[PDB]
C-alpha cells in the first residue's frame, strides 16, 4: 500500500497583508515537496533528493496551483468570518487535507478530503466522493454551495485519476528509498526510580515507515513516534517495575521491516 | 501533484 497526501495551511495575519500559506506533500511517510509563501523562494520546491531532476514544466504548474489555492483560501477566511460573526482583529486558520491510497494490488483503494476551520472539522468530502457533508453547523452554506456546483466531480477526478497517476510516477522516481524497508534497532535501558521501583524502557530506533507497535509483557508510558531527521523514525515504550525481578517483563516489537516480530530483554 | 482546484466556501 502507498499513499499521496497533501496538507495545506492558511493562517490569517490581519496585521500584515496576505495570510501565511504552507503546502506540504507526502509519499507514504516521506515528505517530497513544499510551498511556503513566506520562504525566500515562494514557489513549490523539492524536499527529497529524488525530486531535483524535474524541470521548469512541473514546478511552474505546482506554483500556480499553490498560489491559486492560497488566493482562494484568503477569500475563504474572509467568508468564514462572515459565517461565524468574528472580528477582523483575530487570526484564524483554514486547513485542507487531501490524499489517495493504493491497495496491495497497487490500484486505487480510497480517496479522502476534508477542511478544518480553527482546528475544528468544517467540511468533509463523502466516501463515495460524489458530495460534501458539513461537520460544523456553520458549514451548511458551504455544504450546499459545493453540492450545487458539482465540486465533488473535480475532486473525484483528482483522487481517482490524477492522484493515482502521479503517485505511480513518484514511486518510480523514488524507487531506491520509498520501497526500502528499514528495520528498527532495538534495546532496553534501566533507570532506578527508588529502592522499590525502577523504569524499563524499550527503544525502537531508525526505522521506516513510521508504523510500529511496541508492547510490554498498567504503568505503561508510550511516546508519540518522532522523526530522526534523515527520514527515519524513533519511538520508546516504558514500564514501571518493582525493584528486583524485571525479567517477567518483555518487550514486543512489531514492524514491517523485520523478518519476524522481535522480543527484547534488557541485558544488565 | 496537489489538487488543482479547491472550494470557494
Amino acid at each position, epitope marked *: 500500500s502507498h499513499s499521496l497526501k497533501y496538507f495545506h495551511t492558511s493562517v490569517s495575519r490581519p496585521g500584515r497583508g496576505e495570510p501565511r500559506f504552507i503546502s506540504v506533500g507526502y509519499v507514504d511517510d516521506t515528505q517530497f515537496v513544499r510551498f511556503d509563501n513566506d520562504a525566500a523562494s515562494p514557489r513549490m520546491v523539492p524536499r527529497a533528493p529524488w525530486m531535483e531532476q524535474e524541470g521548469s514544466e512541473y514546478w511552474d504548474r505546482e506554483t500556480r496551483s499553490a498560489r*491559486d489555492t492560497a*488566493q482562494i483560501f484568503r*477569500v475563504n477566511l*474572509r467568508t468564514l468570518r462572515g459565517y461565524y460573526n468574528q472580528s477582523e482583529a483575530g487570526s484564524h486558520t483554514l486547513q485542507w487535507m487531501h490524499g489517495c491510497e493504493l491497495g496491495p494490488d497497487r490500484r486505487f483503494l480510497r480517496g479522502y478530503e476534508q477542511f478544518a476551520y480553527d482546528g475544528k472539522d468544517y467540511l468533509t468530502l463523502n466516501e463515495d466522493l460524489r458530495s460534501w457533508t458539513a461537520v460544523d453547523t456553520a458549514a451548511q452554506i458551504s455544504e450546499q454551495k459545493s453540492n450545487d*456546483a458539482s465540486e465533488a466531480e473535480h475532486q473525484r477526478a483528482y483522487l481517482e485519476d490524477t492522484c493515482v497517476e502521479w503517485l505511480h510516477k513518484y514511486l518510480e522516481k523514488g524507487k531506491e528509498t520509498l520501497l526500502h524497508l528499514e528495520p528498527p534497532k532495538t534495546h532496553v535501558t534501566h533507570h532506578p526510580i527508588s529502592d522499590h521501583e525502577a523504569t524499563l524502557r524499550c527503544w525502537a530506533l531508525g526505522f521506516y515507515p513510521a508504523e510500529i507497535t511496541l508492547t510490554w509483557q498498567q504503568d505503561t508510558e508510550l511516546v508519540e513516534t518522532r522523526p530522526a531527521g534523515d527520514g527515519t523514525f524513533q519511538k520508546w515504550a516504558a514500564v514501571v517495575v518493582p525493584s528486583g525481578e524485571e525479567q517477567r517483563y518483555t518487550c514486543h516489537v512489531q514492524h514491517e521491516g523485520l523478518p519476524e516480530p522481535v522480543t527484547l530483554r534488557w541485558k544488565p | 501533484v496537489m489538487a488543482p*482546484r479547491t472550494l470557494i466556501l
Partner: T-cell receptor, first 109, second 111 residues
Framework: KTTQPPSMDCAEGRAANLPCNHS???????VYWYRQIHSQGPQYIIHGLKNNETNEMASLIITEDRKSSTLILPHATLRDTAVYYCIVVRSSNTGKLIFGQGTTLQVKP | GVTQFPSHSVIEKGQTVTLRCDPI?????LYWYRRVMGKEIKFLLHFVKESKQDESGMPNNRFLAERTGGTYSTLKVQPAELEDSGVYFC??????????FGPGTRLTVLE
C-alpha cells in the same frame, strides 16, 4: 490544443455532428463546448469528462480513448448558425477558456 | 443574465472609458474577456468575489479593473490606444464550469 474543421455546412431539420480532436488530453481535463451567434456573448452549450451526456440544447459523445469529441445538435435550425468552440479546460480554480478558431456552422435552409 | 454598459463606445486616442458589468447576482466569480479585432476571444481577468484570482490576460498598466463590493465590476482603459478597439465581454459563474456572458461592449478607439 483542440482541432475542429474551420467550417461546416448543414441542412436544417436534420442533426449536426461537429467533431473535435484533443489527443493530448489528460484525465483531469474537461471537454467544453460554447457557441457564439454573430457578435453577441458566447453561450455555454454542454461539457463532459468521459461518458456521453445530454441536455435540452445538445448532446456530447466522448470516445473511450478520450482523444476526440462530437457535439450533436438534435434538430438544427437557422438560429443554430454560429461559430462553435470546442475548448478543453484542465481542472483549475479559475476555469479560464481558450477560444480556438472553432467551427463556423452554416445551417443552410 | 449578465449586463454590460455601454453597449457601444467611440472615443479619441488618449481618452478614458469605464466599462461596467453587472453579473447575475449571487455569482462568486466574474470574468472579463475581449476580442481585439482580427483575433480570437481571450481571457483578461477573473474575480473570486472582490479579489483578483487570475490576472494573466491583462494587457498592460493602462488597464485597471475593480469589483469593490464583489457585485458589479468596472474596467477602465486610461489612456486608450487604437489597438484596444474591439469587443469586451463580461461573464459570471457560480461553478466556474458554466460561464454566462453579457452582450459585450463594442469599443472603437479612433485617432
Amino acid at each position: 490544443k483542440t482541432t475542429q474543421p474551420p467550417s461546416m455546412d448543414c441542412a436544417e431539420g436534420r442533426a449536426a455532428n461537429l467533431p473535435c480532436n484533443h489527443s493530448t488530453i489528460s484525465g483531469n481535463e474537461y471537454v467544453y463546448w460554447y457557441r457564439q451567434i454573430h457578435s453577441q456573448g458566447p453561450q455555454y452549450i454542454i461539457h463532459g469528462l468521459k461518458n456521453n451526456e445530454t441536455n435540452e440544447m445538445a448532446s456530447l459523445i466522448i470516445t473511450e480513448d478520450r482523444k476526440s469529441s462530437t457535439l450533436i445538435l438534435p434538430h438544427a435550425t437557422l438560429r443554430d448558425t454560429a461559430v462553435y468552440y470546442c475548448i478543453v479546460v484542465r481542472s483549475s480554480n479559475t476555469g479560464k477558456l481558450i477560444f480556438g478558431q472553432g467551427t463556423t456552422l452554416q445551417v443552410k435552409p | 443574465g449578465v449586463t454590460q454598459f455601454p453597449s457601444h463606445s467611440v472615443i479619441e486616442k488618449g481618452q478614458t472609458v469605464t466599462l461596467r458589468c453587472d453579473p447575475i447576482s449571487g455569482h462568486d466569480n466574474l470574468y472579463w474577456y475581449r476580442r481585439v479585432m482580427g483575433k480570437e476571444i481571450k481571457f483578461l481577468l477573473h474575480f473570486v468575489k472582490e479579489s483578483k484570482q487570475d490576472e494573466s490576460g491583462m494587457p498592460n498598466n493602462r488597464f485597471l479593473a475593480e469589483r469593490t463590493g464583489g457585485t458589479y465590476s468596472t474596467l477602465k482603459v486610461q489612456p486608450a490606444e487604437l489597438e484596444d478597439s474591439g469587443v469586451y465581454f463580461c461573464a459570471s459563474s457560480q461553478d466556474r464550469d458554466t460561464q454566462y456572458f453579457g452582450p459585450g461592449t463594442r469599443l472603437t478607439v479612433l485617432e
